[PDB]
Write a protein that binds this ligand. Structure first.
Ligand SMILES: [Cl-]
Length: 299
């Protein structure tokens, strides 16, 4: 588990908040605290499950082992020497290592970790891209090489593989209209997108639940999707680097293609603001039915 870059941690925090914030009067007060690494109220099931969510996605809590795991702390510090002081990182890792084996329920996981969170707040916040000043500097260093805050993930990938001002830019006319290109460049670009929206994991595996999540958000049933994906999986290519493209092509050409395009389009919109749904769950409405950088597409 790990290391995680700033975008990866932002994804984790915002996803866990989206899934765990209450839907009533407590929503905004809780959001204001959790955003600032204040895991309160400690007695709230919402806070407890939020905390467990973050710990599971980072690998600090291993739900299979039913124990905490400090390995990610060392992986994180190795990747980001500027974000920790060795003695402090070691003290934090030690505190995690010495936590007892803990049941895989929100309350138990949260209660066990909370003392560590508080005793090592700055250490953990700095290391895992929660320090606003440090993270701003890292985003500047990375520039075009990482998806930036408030940037469409699709645009991040497009700009990497089909850069503005290049003879490649024109291909976006076809790409944005769901034309499935066959070349190595497009396969890499599609890997960038599919991994960026988490349809494909870091180890090139399909995450059916993530695709389903996006169907449900556009009010589409997922039974037909699951059947299509099962068929696509039965014909999965053996070369790891082609798996993202394989699933993209399969979905685009399948009997769920229209629902897929609708779901994928809305995911692109939501990828522009990771906190899209946090102040309040936003209602989805199908956009009314092309230009690239102001230039008219010939198709
Ligand atoms: Cl964002």
């Amino acid at each position: 588990m790990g290391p995680f870059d700033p975008e990866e941690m932002l994804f984790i925090f915002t996803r866990c908040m989206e899934d765990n914030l209450e839907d009533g009067a407590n929503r905004l007060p809780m959001l204001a605290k959790w955003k600032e690494w204040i895991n309160e109220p400690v007695d709230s099931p919402a806070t407890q499950c939020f905390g467990k969510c973050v710990l599971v996605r980072t690998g600090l809590y291993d739900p299979v082992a039913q124990k905490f795991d400090a390995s990610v702390i060392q992986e994180q510090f190795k990747a980001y020497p500027s974000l920790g002081e060795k003695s402090k990182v070691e003290a934090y890792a030690n505190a995690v290592k010495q936590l007892p084996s803990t049941n895989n329920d929100c309350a138990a996981v949260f209660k066990a970790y909370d003392p560590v969170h508080k005793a090592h707040k700055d250490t953990s916040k700095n290391l895992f891209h929660g320090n606003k000043e440090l993270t701003k500097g890292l985003y500047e260093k990375l520039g075009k090489d990482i998806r930036q805050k408030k940037q469409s993930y699709f645009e991040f990938c497009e700009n990497k593989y089909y850069p503005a001002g290049s003879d490649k830019r024109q291909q976006l006319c076809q790409i944005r209209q769901y034309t499935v290109l066959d070349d190595a460049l497009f396969k890499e670009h599609t890997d960038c997108v599919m991994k960026g929206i988490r349809y494909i994991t870091k180890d090139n595996q399909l995450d059916v639940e993530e695709v389903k999540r996006d169907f449900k958000l556009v009010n589409k049933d997922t039974k037909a999707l699951e059947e299509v994906l099962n068929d696509c999986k039965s014909k999965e290519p053996s070369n790891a680097k082609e798996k993202s493209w394989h699933y993209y092509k399969c979905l685009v050409e399948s009997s769920v293609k229209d629902d897929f395009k609708e779901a994928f389009d809305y995911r692109e919109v939501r990828s522009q603001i990771y906190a899209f749904n946090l102040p309040k769950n936003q209602a989805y409405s199908k956009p009314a039915v092309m230009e690239i950088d102001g230039k008219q597409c010939p198709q």
